[PDB]
Amino acid sequence: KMSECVLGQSKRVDFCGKGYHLMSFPQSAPHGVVFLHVTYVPAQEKNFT
Amino acid sequence: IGKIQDSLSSALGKLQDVVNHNAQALNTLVKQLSSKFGAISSVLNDILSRLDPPEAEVQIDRLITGRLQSLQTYVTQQLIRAAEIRASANLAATKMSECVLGQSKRVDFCGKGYHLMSFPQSAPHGVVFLHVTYVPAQEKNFTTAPAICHDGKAHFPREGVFVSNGTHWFVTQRNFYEPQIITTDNTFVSGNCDVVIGIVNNTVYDPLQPELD
Amino acid sequence: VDCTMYICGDSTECSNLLLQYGSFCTQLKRALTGIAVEQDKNTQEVFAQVKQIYKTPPIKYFGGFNFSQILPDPSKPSKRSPIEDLLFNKVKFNGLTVLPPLLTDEMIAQYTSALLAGTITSGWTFGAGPALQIPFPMQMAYRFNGIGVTQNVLYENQKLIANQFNSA
Amino acid sequence: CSFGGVSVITPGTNTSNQVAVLYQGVNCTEVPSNVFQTRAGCLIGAEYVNNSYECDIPIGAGICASYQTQSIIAYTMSLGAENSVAYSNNSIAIPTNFTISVTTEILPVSMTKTS
Ligand SMILES: *[C@@H]1O[C@H](CO)[C@@H](O[C@@H]2O[C@H](CO)[C@@H](O)[C@H](O)[C@H]2NC(C)=O)[C@H](O)[C@H]1NC(C)=O
Ligand SMILES: *[C@@H]1O[C@H](CO)[C@@H](O[C@@H]2O[C@H](CO)[C@@H](O)[C@H](O)[C@H]2NC(C)=O)[C@H](O)[C@H]1NC(C)=O
Ligand SMILES: *[C@@H]1O[C@H](CO)[C@@H](O[C@@H]2O[C@H](CO)[C@@H](O)[C@H](O)[C@H]2NC(C)=O)[C@H](O)[C@H]1NC(C)=O
Ligand SMILES: *[C@@H]1O[C@H](CO)[C@@H](O[C@@H]2O[C@H](CO)[C@@H](O)[C@H](O)[C@H]2NC(C)=O)[C@H](O)[C@H]1NC(C)=O
Ligand SMILES: *[C@@H]1O[C@H](CO)[C@@H](O[C@@H]2O[C@H](CO)[C@@H](O)[C@H](O)[C@H]2NC(C)=O)[C@H](O)[C@H]1NC(C)=O
Ligand SMILES: *[C@@H]1O[C@H](CO)[C@@H](O[C@@H]2O[C@H](CO)[C@@H](O)[C@H](O)[C@H]2NC(C)=O)[C@H](O)[C@H]1NC(C)=O
Ligand SMILES: *[C@@H]1O[C@H](CO)[C@@H](O)[C@H](O)[C@H]1NC(C)=O
Ligand SMILES: *[C@@H]1O[C@H](CO)[C@@H](O)[C@H](O)[C@H]1NC(C)=O
Ligand SMILES: *[C@@H]1O[C@H](CO)[C@@H](O)[C@H](O)[C@H]1NC(C)=O
Ligand SMILES: *[C@@H]1O[C@H](CO)[C@@H](O)[C@H](O)[C@H]1NC(C)=O
């Protein structure tokens, strides 16, 4: 995840959150890591022919 | 490719480790055949020679219990070591699919750089991948803008970046410097030039307009 | 764990009797030492993924977007960020000993802030070679292309997009 | 009391026969020159310098040792160089050349079948 979501942009579905992965930021936790995933979510659709 | 050959001919510690661990465990298994575990000796031909059958049962059981314990410890640690070799082989099988029979876009999965191609080589109990990647070099700075304003319209590059060498404005592709004149063939239009922040004023050249005339 | 001191423990009648079991205690110490050496390699593999220790510029103004809650806090001994401070407030015997990790968590926070400044300043170029600066709005527009949105959708909605990021 | 493991730090017998000794998480006043107190125990036989190098022999809690300054030394490891990106609101860097690089990756697939 640090390689593919923080050092790049991923096209793997759901590997870096819900939506279309834009970017990710790491934070250190005690004995662990936290990833803040920024994604794009579409909204307010209309129907068409 | 000529330097791989030197650096190896002159590094396989992950393969040497596996071998060493297995040998160190097999030796510890045999070296336990010479402990008493609380008996008079370690030899069954010595308990069956200075003890009558009713007294040698008690001494043989003390050896049986110890040797069973040692064999079962050996068999547990092999299950735990095989579950780790299995995951490594599962990763090697994925790298053979995704780096050798394809081009990967995953970052740092098939080397460091931009993956071009991969070649496999067999090793004693494993596999070596030779990863060929592209690495950009020798960068310059320029100044940029997000869009160009011309005739009251805002133009964006189709597949590049707008750059300036100090006095003139070009389009490059983003990973290799190769400047081009900004025309209506490598840009597209959307909107008027007062909502983007950072627009610059410059001329966008129409190829038909002169040539026709 | 010291096998001999957990089992016997001081006494001497127990050490000579335990000597009769062979290398059972040497195996256990090897097993526990391997585990402890693996825990440092876990952390080296997650966090030491960067060549240089990158710094953000002083002005600290990326076309708007506001990263202040996740950049390091200069008024601290640990130099953690505001969210890393929130996360750290929520989480001798009979031969037993606890070894310290090789990396302090000051060092870990220093690796994470450098990964952050690499991303905010160079996008994805520092992960493939030398860091190449690019303005943040233009990097955001490159990323909108990667999900299949046309890049004027970003430039014509920059303020709204930055406000939504900041609220989230 | 004050029990603990004892570790021996050596540059390798093919380099020297000097040695340093770590008494693990023991206060360095109750051990029985260079006596140096660490978060990992008491170190004897190495001098503490103020420089900082790349880690050589890992002691712990950020301290490493080396045979440099002849003898072994202690210090705090180095995370890495220091690169300063000249970021601005209208500056870009673009590469003008490239290098083709090739690296290796080694992976175990099997182990020996024993019965
Ligand atoms: C697009 O049109 C469809 C109908 O063709 C809408 O679907 C209906 O939604 C309503 C409200 O939720 C339901 O009561 C109906 O039963 C749905 N129709 C069917 C056939 O099930 C849909 O909501 C419209 N979407 C948009 C964005 O306009
Ligand atoms: C891009 O331009 C910047 C701006 O001058 C250069 O970065 C400076 O370089 C000088 C000399 O190396 C340093 O003393 C400054 O500290 C740098 N940063 C500043 C001024 O903010 C950089 O060298 C240029 N890059 C290339 C590839 O030419
Ligand atoms: C930016 O690049 C342009 C190239 O188009 C340079 O302008 C030309 O320079 C050549 C050689 O100096 C002249 O023969 C041309 O007459 C110039 N103009 C044109 C329209 O081609 C310009 O000098 C460069 N600027 C900097 C600062 O390097
Ligand atoms: C880019 O070009 C436009 C049009 O040529 C400039 O707009 C003019 O700016 C001057 C000076 O501010 C005004 O007096 C005119 O009324 C403007 N005309 C229009 C149609 O807007 C604009 O200023 C230029 N931008 C820069 C930075 O020079
Ligand atoms: C980035 O966001 C933070 C909020 O998390 C801003 O800091 C707060 O700003 C409001 C007013 O805008 C104050 O009332 C708070 O006291 C601030 N909190 C602090 C300083 O911890 C910060 O100003 C934003 N950055 C910029 C450049 O606007
Ligand atoms: C791009 O880089 C290559 C080096 O990788 C340059 O080619 C070298 O040029 C020097 C000087 O002319 C020679 O001594 C080397 O033998 C060349 N290397 C090889 C592998 O042939 C090349 O000139 C660079 N291109 C640009 C435009 O700067
Ligand atoms: C960039 O910052 C400068 C301050 O030096 C400011 O004058 C200018 O308006 C800014 N431009 C953009 C596009 O943010
Ligand atoms: C080990 O000894 C050999 C010969 O004595 C020498 O060539 C080699 O450099 C030595 N290795 C080290 C690490 O000093
Ligand atoms: C060791 O004991 C002395 C005497 O009380 C004390 O000053 C010192 O702090 C102790 N060591 C450590 C690491 O605290
Ligand atoms: C290391 O630097 C500190 C600075 O506070 C100084 O007090 C100390 O004496 C130095 N150590 C040596 C061995 O010179």
Numbering used by the authors:
A (entry chain B): 1028 to 1076
B (entry chain A): 931 to 940, 944 to 1146
C (entry chain B): 736 to 826, 854 to 930
D (entry chain A): 590 to 621, 640 to 676, 690 to 735
Paper text:
The Omicron sub-lineages harbor multiple mutations in the S protein compared to the original strain (referred to as the WT strain), which mediates receptor recognition and facilitates membrane fusion with the host cells. Despite the extensive mutations, all these Omicron subvariants still utilize ACE2 as the host receptor. Binding of the receptor-binding domain (RBD) to the peptidase domain (PD) of ACE2 triggers conformational changes in the trimeric S protein, leading to exposure of the fusion peptide and facilitating membrane fusion with host cells. Hence, we characterized the ACE2-bound S protein structures derived from BF.7, BA.2.75, and XBB.1 subvariants.
The BA.5 sub-lineage further evolved into BF.7 and even BQ.1.15. On another branch, BA.2 also evolved into BA.2.75 and BA.2.10.1, and subsequently, these two subvariants recombined to form the XBB variant, which has now become one of the most prevalent substrains globally. We then employed single-particle cryo-electron microscopy (cryo-EM) to determine the structures of trimeric S proteins in complex with ACE2-PD. The structures of ACE2-PD in complex with S proteins from BA.2.75, BF.7, and XBB.1 were resolved at overall resolutions of 3.5, 3.9, and 3.9 Å, respectively. For simplicity, these complexes will be referred to as BA.2.75-SA, BF.7-SA, and XBB.1-SA, respectively. In these structures, the RBDs of the S protein are all in the “up” conformation and each one binds to one ACE2 molecule. Besides, XBB.1 displays mutations D339H, V445P, G446S, F486S, F490V, and R493Q when compared to BA.2. The monomeric human ACE2-PD exhibited binding to the RBDs of BA.2, BA.5, BA.2.75, BF.7, and XBB.1 with binding affinity (KD) of 4.80 ± 0.01, 3.2 ± 0.03, 1.2 ± 0.01, 4.1 ± 0.02, and 16.2 ± 0.03 nM, respectively. These values displayed heterogeneity compared to the WT RBD (12.5 ± 0.04 nM). While the increased affinity of Omicron BA.2.75 and BF.7 subvariants for ACE2 may partially explain their enhanced transmissibility, it does not fully account for the prevalence of the XBB.1 subvariant. The hydrophilic side chain of Ser in XBB.1 may disrupt the original hydrophobic interactions involving Phe486 of the RBD with Leu79 and Met82 of ACE2, thereby providing an explanation for the compromised binding affinity observed in XBB.1 and its RBD.
